[PDB]
Design a protein around this ligand. Structure first.
Ligand code: PU1
Length: 208
């Protein structure tokens, strides 16, 4: 049972700009996703202080980076707060509208794509390297969901019947044919060291 949705006009515009603009410094997508993972882990850690039962779906707070050359995927996994169906379909897109407009205007005023995170829309930098993005997420109050988009103005949401993840988010980057350098161990290590060296959670780079 797959539900198909149209992105709000501003988000479809942002995704097109990210796909179409010539911009060589694509590596910045990784810092954006790791930073989102880190914010999600802070959120579950904060909530657990007043309600300890929120860690019943997993005590460990961490980030895994999983490359897979056979599937041509790079997966960012976290055991953070996770997302609800409402976040996936409408809540995040609503907040994204404001950030998208501010980012588009900043670009016209002379800013570059690396500043995307300051506008709360850093997640869409995934499309600098990915032809398709799959998001598997599980929030304590909701079910496990799979969000997916190859851009083109639409995204899908389905109940994920795959392997339960307990609590957290998995961002699966189906890389563009010319972006396989992001499956290489030394390339991932270099980017993490350059942009994500001060994240307060363990980041484990899996090897193939
Ligand atoms: C913006 C923003 C941050 C909030 C949404 N979000 C994101 C980025 C994100 C933003 C989105 O819109 C702006 C969004 O679209 C609905 C999205 O889902 C595909 C994600 Cl993953 N990553 C995580 C994560 N790792 N864990 C949790 F829990 N929430 C996340």
């Amino acid at each position: 049972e797959v539900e198909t949705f149209a992105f709000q006009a501003e988000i479809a515009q942002l995704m097109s700009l990210i796909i179409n603009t010539f911009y060589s410094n694509k590596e910045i997508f990784l810092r954006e996703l790791i930073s989102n993972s880190s914010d999600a882990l802070d959120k579950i850690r904060y909530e657990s202080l007043t309600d300890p039962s929120k860690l019943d779906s997993g005590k460990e707070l961490h980030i895994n980076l999983i490359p897979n050359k056979q599937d041509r995927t790079l997966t960012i996994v976290d055991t953070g707060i996770g997302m609800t169906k409402a976040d996936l379909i409408n809540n995040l897109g609503t907040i994204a509208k404001s950030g998208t407009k501010a980012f588009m205007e900043a670009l016209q005023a002379g800013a570059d794509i690396s500043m995307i995170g300051q506008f709360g829309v850093g997640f869409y930098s995934a499309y600098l390297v990915a032809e398709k993005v799959t998001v598997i997420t599980k929030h304590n109050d909701d079910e496990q969901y799979a969000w997916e988009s190859s851009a083109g103005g639409s995204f899908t949401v389905r109940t994920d019947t795959g392997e339960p993840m307990g609590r957290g988010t998995k961002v699966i980057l189906h890389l563009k044919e010319d972006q396989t350098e992001y499956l290489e161990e030394r390339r991932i290590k270099e980017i993490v060291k350059k942009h994500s060296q001060f994240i307060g959670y363990p980041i484990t780079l899996f090897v193939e």
